[PDB]
Design a protein around this ligand. Structure first.
Ligand code: PB
Ligand code: PB
Length: 137
């Protein structure tokens, strides 16, 4: 559904490399019995059939307002013109399968035209693979 918090990201392409900085997120949805979550962020260039592009932040336990401050780099290839950078927050779970918290994505070609910087609204899993919603206001 919706109202999943927001995330602050920077994503820019420079000389065939995509640099992404995952800063922090605010107001995430509770996922655990204790009312909090143990969030981490998965980054991928999709489609990724062979599942080779995945990178992830560390897991921060017991918070709905994580501050990761982590950076990542992807080397781009020509075929990436048809790919998107997918950013998904998931809850790490000690005793159950990990579950989805919120997401968004950027087209590689679009980032090449204009870098991304700022706060973004977290979307549901399907929606997140298709667009993003900046919230500069
Ligand atoms: Pb959970
Ligand atoms: Pb958990």
């Amino acid at each position: 559904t919706e109202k999943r918090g927001r995330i602050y990201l920077k994503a820019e392409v420079t000389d065939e490399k995509l640099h992404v900085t995952v800063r922090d997120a605010k107001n995430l949805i509770p996922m655990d019995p204790n009312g909090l979550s143990d969030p981490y962020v998965k980054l991928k260039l999709i489609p990724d059939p062979k599942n080779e592009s995945k990178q992830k932040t560390k897991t921060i336990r017991s918070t709905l307002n994580p501050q990761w401050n982590e950076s990542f780099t992807f080397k781009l290839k020509p075929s990436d013109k048809d790919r998107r950078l997918s950013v998904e927050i998931w809850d790490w779970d000690r005793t159950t399968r990990n579950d989805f918290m919120g997401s968004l994505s950027f087209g590689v070609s679009e980032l090449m035209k204009m870098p991304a910087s700022g706060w973004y609204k977290l979307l549901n899993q399907e929606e997140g693979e298709y667009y993003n919603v900046p919230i500069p206001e």
